[PDB]
Amino acid sequence: SAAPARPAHPLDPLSTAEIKAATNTVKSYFAGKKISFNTVTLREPARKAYIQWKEQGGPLPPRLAYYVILEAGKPGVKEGLVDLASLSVIETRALETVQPILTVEDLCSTEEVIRNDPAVIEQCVLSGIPANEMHKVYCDPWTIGYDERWGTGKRLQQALVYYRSDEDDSQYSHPLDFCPIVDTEEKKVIFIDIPNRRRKVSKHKHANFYPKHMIEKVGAMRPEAPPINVTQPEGVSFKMTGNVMEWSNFKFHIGFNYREGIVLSDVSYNDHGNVRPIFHRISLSEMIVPYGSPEFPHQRKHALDIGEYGAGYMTNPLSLGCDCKGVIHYLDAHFSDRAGDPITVKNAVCIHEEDDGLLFKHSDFRDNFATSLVTRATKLVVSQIFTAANYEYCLYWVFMQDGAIRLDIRLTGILNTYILGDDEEAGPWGTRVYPNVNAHNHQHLFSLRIDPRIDGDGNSAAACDAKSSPYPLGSPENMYGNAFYSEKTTFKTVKDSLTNYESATGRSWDIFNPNKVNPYSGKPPSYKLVSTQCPPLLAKEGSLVAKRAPWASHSVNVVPYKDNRLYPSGDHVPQWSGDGVRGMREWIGDGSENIDNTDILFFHTFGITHFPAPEDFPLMPAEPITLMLRPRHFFTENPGLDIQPSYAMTTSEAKRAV
């Protein structure tokens, strides 16, 4: 658009018209050059500018698009900003020594390259696939991640190769032994990693999971179960105005981008007319999935899924009534493809409300529980599912009627697999999940990025450790040895914040406003992070994994806010060695900057360590991960008590029923 209609809300994602305006603007600025588009996305307003606009009648922030382009024959990328109202490029630079995120188009192009490459064909034949069956060879073409033979000097993928006997097979039972290295932009194989011990393609049957396969494998499918139907005959209780949600006193903006997927902003709670801010922004900002086999070339498997592929780019169009059950409001996602044209993923986000059991209950034993009050809970769910080659990550942002917010994740999909010889032991680094199939050990780690405003600006964070009293059993201070308390360590400088979950203290963390006080308890209003799926990073200090994901070696990292501190392994993740002051390493600095009562960013590392078993193959049952942020000392009483009970009978009423 010329200029584009500006959005309803400054945090709305770029419309398809805005995306096209941005790419036309960039094409014109680079006229006479052959360029392609890697990223065209909203450059969100500065936090100050946004808050000022929202709450102080301030300036309208300009509507800006951030782009990343490649140019034929030039190394690295160029990036910059387009001002949409004037259709001009206002910032631009060349970054010749980085590589960018891999788009779906980029994942889709590698198969034709390797199928037609003579050296790859030769390895296929050595592996036992005839030269004329190349259409049966497939690959998951990961970023090379990091290989010290090339650095960032070419843009590279590593084709993890597999074989299908029929196109409807699940290929993951038949990995091949070798790994071609592909120059993404030149479209050619530059190298093939070949193991010292060769293992030829498995001769077993594929391990398949569609109904036609299972009928052959186990005799029959189970009959259809009788349905469980879920209806909202009088509609839903939430209200959307564009991307702005209001539900059970919560209000917030639902955003979305190519990289983070869902981005929740401007989150507040309406406390009987007093609208109290909670978070300025919350999202997942990066991931790392480090594998645990030391043998070459498997050190290159440590995918930073968000930075290297994108939870937006990889997001699934969710299916009419299957992925999301019940009455659903959907949002579409819009990106640019390599030619500069907008592409849409329909039904990328689903939004709906679901039963969530009991909110609270109490009954009196005195009349045999006749005196009783029970109130049911409803939750609001904002969700997407993304597919990073083999993996499926189901992400659910959950708002609850006690004022808590939960992130739930379910891992499913398929294990990454490598070939195993008939006599080869997989342990200790993997598991034989099927004949000739080694599924290597790995971790899934996530970096949750919280930009808080607990009851307003000026916040701090703290570790909370349960501790026995230091006074011994038998002392006047602790006669019976039962005394215990919560030790709160307020983080003063960045260094103080660098903390891990500790089972020995049941560690939680507070994000609080030290400028306010709860009139009952005397404590600051807070949201408490309750999170126990917090694995140590197993890779060693100084390892490639530890270097490329500096955020992952602590459960909690707290840094001063600054604009554009979104991505903790840096802006351009693929093929960075992990050497340099960028991302979280930059933001931590020398550890000395103040983080007490200021504008802060709280980054939480959480996830699981996965030791594969046969139950996970050929397709894996959902594995749950959760964390919760809970109001503590935020309210002066339970915020849900004005919700009509499902059943309520008082002591006097019970006497009147006789």
Binders of its own copies among residues 434 to 463 (CB under 8 A) are 434-435, 441
Each residue 539-578 as x (binds its own copies by CB under 8 A) or -, in order, gives xxxxxxxx--------------------------------
- Please enumerate in sequence order all residues whose Cβ is within 8 A of that of 240, keeping only pairs 6 or more positions apart, or say none: 246, 329, 351
Query: Is 422 annotated as contributing to ligand binding?
Result: no
Q: Which of 391, 418, 501, 527 is catalytic?
A: 391
Three-state secondary-structure class, residue 586: helix
Closest CA to 453 of 601, 630, 245: 601
Instruction: State yes or no: residue 289 binds its own copies (CB under 8 A).
Output: no
Query: Is 303 annotated as contributing to ligand binding?
Result: yes
Element (H, E) at 213: helix 211-218
Three-state secondary-structure class, residue 654: helix
Name the residue nearer to its own copies (CB basis): 412 or 493.
412
- Please enumerate in sequence order all residues whose Cβ is within 8 A of that of 539, keeping only pairs 6 or more positions apart, or say none: 290, 302, 545, 546
Instruction: State yes or no: residue 168 binds its own copies (CB under 8 A).
Output: yes
Residue 604 CB, shortest distance to its own copies, in Å, is 14
Which residues face 489 on adjacent strands? 463
- Please enumerate in sequence order all residues whose Cβ is within 8 A of that of 56, keeping only pairs 6 or more positions apart, or say none: none
Which residues face 251 on adjacent strands? 246, 268
Binding positions for its own copies, 615-644, rule CB under 8 A: 615-622, 630-644
Which residues face 410 on adjacent strands? 394, 624
Instruction: State yes or no: residue 610 binds Cu ion (CB under 5 A).
Output: yes
With CB cut-offs between 5 and 8 Å by kind, which of its own copies, Cu ion, none does residue 376 bind? its own copies
Residue 473 CB, shortest distance to its own copies, in Å, is 5
Task: Give yes or no: 391 in active site.
Answer: yes
Query: Is 51 annotated as contributing to ligand binding?
Result: no
Cα-based angle 30, 36, 39 (whole degrees, multiple of 5): 105
Instruction: State yes or no: residue 357 binds its own copies (CB under 8 A).
Output: yes
The answer to whether the bond into 3 is cis (omega within 30° of 0) is yes
Other CB atoms within 10 A of residue 618 CB: 20
The full length of the chain comes to 658
Tokens of 588: 């931590």
Query: Is 442 annotated as contributing to ligand binding?
Result: yes
Question: For residues 308 and 99, what is the distance between their CA atoms, to the nearest angstrom?
Answer: 9
Q: How many residues bind Cu ion (CB under 5 A)?
A: 1
Question: For residues 332 and 353, what is the distance between their CA atoms, to the nearest angstrom?
Answer: 19
Instruction: State yes or no: residue 334 binds its own copies (CB under 8 A).
Output: no
Name the residue nearer to its own copies (CB basis): 72 or 215.
215
Query: Is 84 annotated as contributing to ligand binding?
Result: no
Helix 118-126 to helix 104-115 angle (10° resolution) is 70
Residue 284 CB, shortest distance to its own copies, in Å, is 19
Name the residue nearer to its own copies (CB basis): 67 or 172.
172
Which residues face 159 on adjacent strands? 141
Q: How many residues bind its own copies (CB under 8 A)?
A: 171
CA 516 to chain centre: 32
What sign for the dihedral angle of Cα 364, 370, 371, 376? positive
With CB cut-offs between 5 and 8 Å by kind, which of its own copies, Cu ion, none does residue 71 bind? none
Residue 444 CB, shortest distance to Cu ion, in Å, is 6
Closest CA to 396 of 359, 448, 344, 350: 350
Binding positions for its own copies, 214-273, rule CB under 8 A: 214, 218-237, 272
Query: Is 600 annotated as contributing to ligand binding?
Result: yes
Name the residue nearer to its own copies (CB basis): 67 or 527.
527
Query: Is 613 annotated as contributing to ligand binding?
Result: no
Query: Is 348 annotated as contributing to ligand binding?
Result: no
Residue 77 CB, shortest distance to its own copies, in Å, is 23
Query: Is 561 annotated as contributing to ligand binding?
Result: no
Tokens of 189: 């194989």
Question: For residues 363 and 380, what is the distance between their CA atoms, to the nearest angstrom?
Answer: 28
Residue 111 CB, shortest distance to its own copies, in Å, is 8
Torsion angles phi and psi, residue 341, rounded to 5: -100, 140
Question: For residues 230 and 216, what is the distance between their CA atoms, to the nearest angstrom?
Answer: 34
Instruction: State yes or no: residue 632 binds Cu ion (CB under 5 A).
Output: no
Binding positions for its own copies, 84-113, rule CB under 8 A: 104, 107-108, 111
Residue 203 CB, shortest distance to its own copies, in Å, is 16
Instruction: State yes or no: residue 582 binds Cu ion (CB under 5 A).
Output: no
Instruction: State yes or no: residue 203 binds its own copies (CB under 8 A).
Output: no
Name the residue nearer to its own copies (CB basis): 188 or 655.
655
Torsion angles phi and psi, residue 115, rounded to 5: -60, -30
Residue 92 CB, shortest distance to its own copies, in Å, is 32
- How far the first Cα of the chain sits from its last, in Å, is 73
Binding positions for its own copies, 64-83, rule CB under 8 A: none
Name the residue nearer to its own copies (CB basis): 279 or 634.
634
Instruction: State yes or no: residue 402 binds its own copies (CB under 8 A).
Output: yes
By CB under 8 A, name the one of 36, 97, 469, 490 that touches its own copies: 469
Binding positions for its own copies, 495-534, rule CB under 8 A: 500-506, 518, 520-523, 532-534
Instruction: State yes or no: residue 373 binds its own copies (CB under 8 A).
Output: yes
Strands 556-560 and 77-83: unpaired
Task: Give yes or no: 305 in active site.
Answer: yes
Tokens of 648: 């309520």
Q: Which residues are annotated as a binding site for Mn(2+)?
A: 451, 599-600
Q: Which residues are annotated as a binding site for Cu cation?
A: 442, 444, 610
Residues with active-site annotation: 305, 391
Q: Which residues are annotated as a binding site?
A: 303-314, 388-393, 442, 444, 451, 599-600, 610
